[PDB]
Amino acid sequence: EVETFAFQAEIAQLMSLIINTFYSNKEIFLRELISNSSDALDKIRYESLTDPSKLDSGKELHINLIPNKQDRTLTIVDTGIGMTKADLINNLGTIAKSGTKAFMEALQAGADISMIGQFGVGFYSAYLVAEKVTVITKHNDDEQYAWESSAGGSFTVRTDGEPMGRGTKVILHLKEDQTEYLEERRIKEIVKKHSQFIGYPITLFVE
Ligand SMILES: Cc1cccc(Cc2n[nH]c3cc(O)c(C(=O)N(C)Cc4ccc(Cl)cc4)cc23)c1
Secondary structure (H helix, E strand, C coil): CCEEEECCHHHHHHHHHHHHCCCCCHHHHHHHHHHHHHHHHHHHHHHHHHCHHHHCCCCCCCEEEEEECCCCEEEEEECCCCCCHHHHHHHCCHHHHHHHHHHHHHHHCCCCHHHHHHHCCHHHHHHHCEEEEEEEEECCCCCEEEEEECCCCEEEEEECCCCCCCEEEEEEEECHHHHHHHCHHHHHHHHHHHCCCCCCCEEECCC
């Protein structure tokens, strides 16, 4: 069964702003997603000190960037802590509201969309390049879930597909005019410019 949820008003507004605003510096979405992967990897590295059994679902702590020109998708995979069904919906809850509002006000005060991550809502920058985002996640304490949204004020959640052990996979179904983010040289340049100091291996898969 598929569950359909409405985004909180501020999020639906933020997502419309991101989609409708003229903003050429779209490449910032990647830094935001990598930064989110990095935080999940730190959380699993930290929980594994006190409880080593939390790494039974996978020892390797890494980020994989997977472009697929046939499906027109860019996949960002990590082996971080992952998210429970509760983490999924709770992170699309009241926490994001304060950040969204502060970001919304900053933009009116002259800040630009590249500052989105400082407000903890960097994920939504994925809608600068993606017409639809699918998020597959697996936490040690729960089952595998698939979150999906093409914006429009709603998102869906369902029990997920091939098992992934532990972590989060972000599948960006790119807009027709955003296929440059499938090119090896373009992804390399962006990772080098914005994510050069990430404390985890970043493997750019080739096709
Ligand atoms: C649909 C959806 C729902 C909730 C949050 C997101 C943001 C997101 N983008 N890329 C990610 C990669 C990840 O490994 C995680 C992850 O599993 N974490 C434990 C770290 C984490 C949690 C909350 C936030 Cl706000 C940021 C990082 C999340 C994200 C997207």
